[PDB]
């Protein structure tokens, strides 16, 4: 049977598949056609149906897992299209995590003799993240940060070493946000969460601008000016608020200029997309900073798919965490951002 | 000259006026007509122009201030209409605070010989709050909370004593949010702030629903169902998330159901007004709780005008702080919610 791990989130299903590359002559003969056509279908296509995507650039090659050499593949599709996935499956031990492992448990069991083992979101995320960093990204660092995030002429992606990764604050930006404090391989807790996450950005953006995809929303935001919608410290004070070290450019009230009808009439959809992105991102950064301070942790790693192909938000998080913490905290990012739960699920396979 | 204190915020100007009631026979004769017509105009009207309002129910009567007995009056109008206020003034020592004391400094000096003394927002808020609580609300408690905020059949406003008020976490919800830690009468700090405040509610509401006033926005929200826009824990898990004590009713992603076109098409403006209010209010509550935990303070007082005639948000804050803190924190409220900076300004008058 094929080796999958699946993280069924509120928005996206993430799938990790291990493709063995040490298939012997005897093993190839003694393999069932449906197993052969699964591997063929998955490795010969990068789009699956109309909404499935293989993130080819993330592939881990020549990985030794469970005593086999193979390639680790990373695949995603909308949770909305899980019925299509299950129907295809009805035309195997499945380790699954995320809320959808519970919600859609009965649906997966419509696949005859399929064994569904549910694993907790937290153990899977932590196990997957530590594993991927431990095997490296094909010899390159899995973890990176933005050096000199204060000056834009100097700001550049640089690798970051996590050989001793503890303690770690993990900020998981999915539909919502979960915040975890990791003190060791077996000692971690969910510190808190916020409901202002990726689904808020996408939902509000679609309401305000009519955008029809995550990528279109980011493309509108790259052309916008959030200060058209937001009220800044200088709009209230006429400059800096010296007494409390608030610069004139800080946002005092997100969307706060939209209380005036004349401003609502002149703002562009691109401006509103950017103000939505900036509002959500800054609020995540601030919550992350308060949790780091309370947990006494200075390394904050951001994961989840809100940050995929989203350099605006990454740079904003890098700059804001460094500025508002007076350099006490480092914003850290990971190449395999959205897939750690799916990997951790796959890694629970020996337990069954 | 009349005794005013003024807090010019980003959205509202708040004015406290002390009306002496011990005016002797000689003092009344030796008073200039313009001084007489000011007092007459202010005490004989409750609407001023088309946007000024005297909050008559807040009046403090027979207060002894600066060695005179008088009544303390509380008046508000939009910062947008401050030019009208200044023009009326051109047809006095002014203690002023808030950002607008700096921004509009030069405008106030167009009033001949008027002396403008700017006072810091923080000192004024703390001084005003402690003063009003110390003199009481005409013999009644200035401070109150919602008893048994968990059960709605029992939930009722009850008075709360602040005779020793320290330490105190003050959460000032204006256009944005400022959070203060008060350890004594002369020892207080701004802990942090958030830009998701009252102006966010009003700005987003106006964009999403077309509402044209704060009160209309609250009226739409009272008729709405935020779960039409928000994605709940049970939408993702199918129930509670037992492992982390997240109830199925908690919001997992604010506006997170609005990523689906069919849901955007069926949601009502009232639903979106309520989701806006709930999103902003819960985020303020969560930030307040994290700051309380980090400052080791268990009493959290909420002020500012986001909460005036807004019992939905007060009850939401009362219930959420008690629930998520497992009863460790008390949400506290004050009758003179939006006016403490204006009172504190007035109290700086002897210094000049
Ligand atoms: N193709 C995409 N479609 C939808 N959302 C996307 C896409 N790419 C990135 N995103 C963003 O990524 C978020 C989902 O991230 P993800 O980490 O996969 O959450 P999730 O696991 O589905 N939700 P959760 O149950 O809270 O853990 C969305 O809210 C978007 O902001
Ligand atoms: N009549 C009203 N008009 C406008 N906003 C109102 C009104 N009544 C209540 N509000 C709410 O109260 C908020 C303003 O509160 P307030 O404490 O007066 O802020 P502010 O001092 O003007 N702003 P700031 O500079 O950040 O301190 C608005 O954002 C609304 O949510
Ligand atoms: O964690 C969350 C939200 C959440 C839930 C679930 C998930 C994903 C599916 C697993 C998330 F990403 C996010 N909340 C707990 C803390 N909250 C508050 C609110 C008020 C106060 Cl006063 N304090 N805290 C807000 C709710
Ligand atoms: O206080 C504020 C906002 C603010 C300013 C001014 C006023 C009123 C006029 C006086 C407010 F009500 C609110 N901010 C500091 C903390 N912020 C962050 C952001 C990212 C990170 Cl990572 N950390 N912190 C956000 C900005
Ligand atoms: Mg997820
Ligand atoms: Mg104010």
Q: Is B236 on the interface with A (CB under 8 A)?
A: yes
CB B207 within 8 A of CB A271: no
Helix then strand then coil, in percent of chain A rounded to 5, is 45, 25, 30
Q: Select from B73, B52, B46 the least CA-distant residue to B62.
A: B73
Q: Are strands A168-173 and A156-159 parallel, antiparallel or unpaired?
A: unpaired
Do B59 and B110 sit in the same domain of this protein? yes
Q: Is B231 on the interface with A (CB under 8 A)?
A: yes
State if residue A320 touches ligand 4 by the CB under 6 angstroms criterion.
yes
Q: Select from A287, A294, A296, A352 the least CA-distant residue to A324.
A: A287
- Distance, in Å, from the CA atom of B337 to the CA atom of B331, rounded to the nearest integer, reads 14
Question: Which residues in chain B are closer than 8 Å to A241, comparing Cβ atoms?
Answer: 99
Cis peptide before B252 (omega within 30 of 0): no
Chain centroid, CA B100 distance in Å? 17
End-to-end CA distance of chain B: 13
End-to-end CA distance of chain A: 13
Angle at A67 between CA A65 and CA A70, to 5 degrees: 50
Residue A254, marked binder: no
Single out the residue in B207, B237, B267 at which a domain terminates.
B267
- Distance, in Å, from the CA atom of B181 to the CA atom of B188, rounded to the nearest integer, reads 6
> Active-site residue among A121, A142, A295, A337?
A121
Do B210 and B99 sit in the same domain of this protein? no
What length is written for chain A?
Answer: 352
Do B250 and B278 sit in the same domain of this protein? no
The chain A residue lying nearest B243, using CA atoms, is A120
Bin B27: left if φ > 0, else alpha if -120 < ψ < 50, else beta: alpha
Q: Are strands B177-184 and B187-194 parallel, antiparallel or unpaired?
A: antiparallel
Radius of gyration of chain B (CA): 22
Q: At what angle do helices B214-222 and B311-324 cross, to 10 degrees?
A: 60
- Distance, in Å, from the CA atom of A334 to the CA atom of A34, rounded to the nearest integer, reads 35
CB A117 within 8 A of CB A105: no
Provide the number of structural domains found in chain B: 3
Residue numbers of B between 240 and 259 with CB closer than 8 Å to A: 241, 243-244, 246, 250-259
Q: Cβ–Cβ of A195/B279 closer than 8 Å? A: yes
| B255: containing domain | 225-267
Do A261 and A186 sit in the same domain of this protein? no
Contacts (Cβ under 8 Å, ≥6 apart) of B223: B270, B274
Active site residue A121: yes
SS3 B192: strand
B125 CA to middle of ligand 2, Å?
15
SS3 B72: strand
> Nearest-CA distance from A37 to chain B in Å?
32
Chain centroid, CA A302 distance in Å? 8
Do B18 and B46 sit in the same domain of this protein? yes
CB B341 within 8 A of CB B124: yes
Instruction: Tell me the two tokens of residue B251.
Output: 């919001």
Q: Tell me the β-bridge partners of B190.
A: B180
Do B4 and B131 sit in the same domain of this protein? yes
* Resolution to 1 decimal place, in Å: 2.0
Return the C-alpha torsion angle B78, B84, B89, B90, nearest 10.
150
CB A352 within 8 A of CB A3: no
CB B334 within 8 A of CB B317: no
Tally of CB atoms within 10 A around A266? 10
Q: Which residues line ligand 1 (CB under 6 A)?
A: A 9-12, 98-99, 174-176, 198-199, 201-202, 214, 304-306, 308, 338; B 236, 252
Q: Which residues line ligand 3 (CB under 6 A)?
A: A 99, 174, 176-178, 192-195, 197; B 233, 236, 246, 250, 252, 282, 285-286, 289, 320-321, 324
Q: Select from A193, A214, A194 the least CA-distant residue to A277.
A: A214
- Distance, in Å, from the CA atom of B13 to the CA atom of B85, rounded to the nearest integer, reads 10
Do B58 and B190 sit in the same domain of this protein? no
Q: Cβ–Cβ of A254/B200 closer than 8 Å? A: yes
State if residue B51 touches ligand 2 by the CB under 6 angstroms criterion.
no
Contacts (Cβ under 8 Å, ≥6 apart) of B165: B130, B133, B182, B299
State if residue B193 touches ligand 2 by the CB under 6 angstroms criterion.
no
Catalytic annotation, residues of B: 121
- Distance, in Å, from the CA atom of A336 to the CA atom of A352, rounded to the nearest integer, reads 26
- Distance, in Å, from the CA atom of B25 to the CA atom of B199, rounded to the nearest integer, reads 48
The chain B residue lying nearest A9, using CA atoms, is B236
Question: Which residues in chain B are closer than 8 Å to A255, comparing Cβ atoms?
Answer: 199-200, 203-204, 207
CA dihedral for A42, A62, A123, B254, sign (positive or negative)? negative
Residue B289 to residues A168, B155, B236, B293, Cα–Cα distance (Å) = 22, 21, 25, 6
Ligand 2, atom 16, residue with closest C-alpha:
B174
Contacts (Cβ under 8 Å, ≥6 apart) of A84: A49
Instruction: Tell me the two tokens of residue B284.
Output: 């303020």
DSSP label at residue B80: G
Residue A178, marked binder: yes
CA B7 to ligand 2: nearest atom: 21
Instruction: Tell me the two tokens of residue B350.
Output: 């002897």
B237 CA to middle of ligand 5, Å?
11
- Buried-exposed string A118-127: b where 16+ CB fall within 10 A, e elsewhere: bbbbbbbbbb
The chain B residue lying nearest A10, using CA atoms, is B236
- Distance, in Å, from the CA atom of B352 to the CA atom of B347, rounded to the nearest integer, reads 11
- Residue indicated by tokens 């593949």: A73
DSSP-derived secondary structure for A252-321: EETTGGGGSHHHHHH--HHHHHHHHHHHHHHHHHHHHHHHHHHHT--EEEEESGGGTT-HHHHHHHHHHH
User: What number of CA atoms fall less than 13 Å from residue A112's CA on the CB side?
Assistant: 2
Single out the residue in B243, B267, B291 at which a domain terminates.
B267
Tally of CB atoms within 10 A around A205? 29
- Distance, in Å, from the CA atom of A226 to the CA atom of A229, rounded to the nearest integer, reads 6
Q: Select from A321, A14, A304, A200 the least CA-distant residue to B255.
A: A200
CB B169 within 8 A of CB B179: yes
Residue numbers of A between 100 and 139 with CB closer than 8 Å to B: 100, 102-103, 120, 122
Tally of CB atoms within 10 A around B47? 10
SS3 A336: coil
Do B148 and B217 sit in the same domain of this protein? yes
A245 CA to middle of ligand 4, Å?
10
Q: Select from B178, B166, B197 the least CA-distant residue to B121.
A: B178
CB B299 within 8 A of CB B169: yes
- Distance, in Å, from the CA atom of A257 to the CA atom of A139, rounded to the nearest integer, reads 49
Do A26 and A147 sit in the same domain of this protein? no
Q: Select from A203, A339, A333 the least CA-distant residue to A279.
A: A203
Q: Is A202 on the interface with B (CB under 8 A)?
A: yes
- The DSSP H or E segment spanning B274 is helix B269-295
| Breaks after residues in chain A, judged by C–N over 2.5 Å | 91
- Residue indicated by tokens 């200039």: B32
Do B51 and B119 sit in the same domain of this protein? yes
Do A296 and A259 sit in the same domain of this protein? no
- Distance, in Å, from the CA atom of A99 to the CA atom of A346, rounded to the nearest integer, reads 16
- Distance, in Å, from the CA atom of B288 to the CA atom of B286, rounded to the nearest integer, reads 5
Q: Is B262 on the interface with A (CB under 8 A)?
A: no
- Residue indicated by tokens 């094929």: A2
Single out the residue in A205, A237, A267 at which a domain terminates.
A267
Residue numbers of A between 266 and 305 with CB closer than 8 Å to B: 272, 279, 282-283, 286-287, 290-291, 293-294
The chain B residue lying nearest A190, using CA atoms, is B244
A79 CA to middle of ligand 5, Å?
11
Instruction: Tell me the two tokens of residue A120.
Output: 């907790």
Contacts (Cβ under 8 Å, ≥6 apart) of A126: A170, A180, A182, A185, A188, A344
CB B242 within 8 A of CB A99: no
With the most atoms of ligand 3 within 8 angstroms of its CB, the residue from B286, B302, B317 to mutate is B286
Instruction: Tell me the two tokens of residue B5.
Output: 């204190």
Tally of CB atoms within 10 A around B213? 12
What length is written for chain B?
Answer: 352
Pick from B195, B251, B258: CB nearest A254: B195
CA dihedral for A199, A202, A208, A211, sign (positive or negative)? negative
Beta strands in B38-81 (DSSP E): 47-48, 52-54, 60-65, 68-78
Q: Cβ–Cβ of A251/B290 closer than 8 Å? A: no
Do A215 and A259 sit in the same domain of this protein? no
CB A328 within 8 A of CB A298: yes
CA dihedral for B156, B160, B166, B172, sign (positive or negative)? positive
Pick from B200, B252, B294: CB nearest A195: B252
- The DSSP H or E segment spanning A161 is none
The bound ligand whose nearest atom lies closest to the alpha carbon of A124 is: 5
Cis peptide before A167 (omega within 30 of 0): yes
Return the C-alpha torsion angle A60, A66, A69, A75, nearest 10.
-30
Question: Which residues in chain A are closer than 8 Å to B285, comparing Cβ atoms?
Answer: none
Chain centroid, CA B256 distance in Å? 29
Query: How was it solved?
Result: X-ray
Alpha helices (H) in chain A, listed in sequence order: 25-29, 33-44, 82-89, 99-103, 105-108, 121-135, 198-209, 214-222, 233-237, 261-266, 269-295, 311-324, 340-347
- Distance, in Å, from the CA atom of A258 to the CA atom of A283, rounded to the nearest integer, reads 19
DSSP-derived secondary structure for B200-213: HHHHHHHHHH---S
Residue B109: phi, psi to the nearest 5? -75, -5
- Residue indicated by tokens 């907790």: A120
């Amino acid at each position: 049977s094929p080796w999958f791990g699946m993280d069924i989130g509120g928005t996206l299903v993430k799938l990790s598949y291990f493709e063995p590359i040490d298939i012997t002559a005897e093993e190839e003969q003694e393999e069932v056609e449906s197993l052969k056509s699964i591997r063929k279908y998955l490795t010969s296509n990068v789009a699956y149906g109309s909404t499935g995507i293989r993130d080819v650039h993330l592939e881990l090659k020549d990985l030794t897992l469970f005593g086999r050499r193979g390639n680790l593949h990373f695949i995603r599709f909308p949770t909305q299209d899980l019925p299509t996935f299950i129907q295809m499956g009805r035309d195997t031990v499945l380790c699954a995590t995320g809320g959808g492992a519970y919600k859609f448990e009965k649906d997966f069991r419509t696949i005859g003799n399929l064994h569904l083992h549910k694993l907790d979101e937290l153990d899977c995320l932590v196990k997957g993240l530590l594993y991927i960093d431990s095997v490296s990204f094909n010899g390159q660092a899995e973890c990176y940060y933005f050096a000199n995030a204060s000056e834009p002429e100097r700001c550049q992606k640089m690798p970051f070493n996590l050989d001793d990764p503890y303690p770690l604050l993990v900020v998981n930006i999915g539909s919502g946000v979960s915040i975890l404090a990791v003190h060791s391989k077996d000692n971690y807790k969910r510190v808190t969460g916020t409901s202002l996450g990726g689904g808020t950005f996408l939902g509000l953006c679609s309401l305000l601008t009519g955008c029809e995809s995550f990528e279109e929303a980011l493309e509108m935001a790259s052309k916008g000016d959030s200060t058209q919608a937001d009220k800044l410290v200088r709009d209230i004070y006429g400059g800096d608020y010296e007494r409390f070290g608030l610069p004139g450019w800080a946002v005092a009230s997100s969307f706060g200029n939209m209380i005036y009808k004349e401003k609502r009439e002149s703002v562009s959809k691109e401006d509103l997309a950017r103000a939505t992105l900036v509002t959500i991102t800054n609020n995540i950064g601030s919550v992350a900073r308060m949790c780091a301070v309370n947990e006494k942790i200075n390394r904050v790693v951001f994961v989840g798919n809100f940050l995929r192909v989203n350099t605006l938000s990454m740079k904003l998080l890098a700059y804001a965490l460094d500025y508002w913490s007076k350099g006490q905290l480092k914003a850290l990012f990971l190449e395999h951002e959205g897939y750690f739960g799916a990997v951790g699920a796959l890694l629970g396979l020996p337990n069954f």
